[PDB]
């Protein structure tokens, strides 16, 4: 069950290349009303 760490550290030596990265981890919120946040999210998803 814990032997996957050795495989992970062995495969981490060689990587690949890719484009169009996703939104990685959680970013920082604007701390505002939900309407403007959801509008910005939907417009960014539409145009990006």
């Amino acid at each position: 069950l814990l032997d996957v760490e050795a495989t992970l550290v062995a495969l981490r030596q060689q990587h690949l290349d890719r484009q169009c990265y996703f939104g990685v981890y959680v970013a920082e919120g604007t701390e505002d009303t939900l309407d403007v946040q959801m509008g910005r999210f939907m417009e960014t998803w539409a145009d990006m």
Binding site: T30, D32, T33, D35, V36, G39
Partner: protein, 48 residues
């Protein structure tokens, strides 16, 4: 019963606060771009 009598009082208090802030301070730390940005969509989202 409803709260629709203090609208004028709130408006005049807000106007006095804004005018005294303009006379004494210069905004700076007060966020002025975020409110305009959110209102830009609020105006077309809440009234329709």
């Amino acid at each position: 019963i409803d709260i629709s009598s203090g609208q004028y009082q709130d408006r005049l208090i807000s106007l006095i606060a804004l005018e005294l802030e303009h006379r004494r301070q210069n905004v700076t730390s007060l966020p002025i771009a975020a409110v305009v940005s959110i209102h830009d969509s609020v105006m077309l989202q809440y009234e329709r």
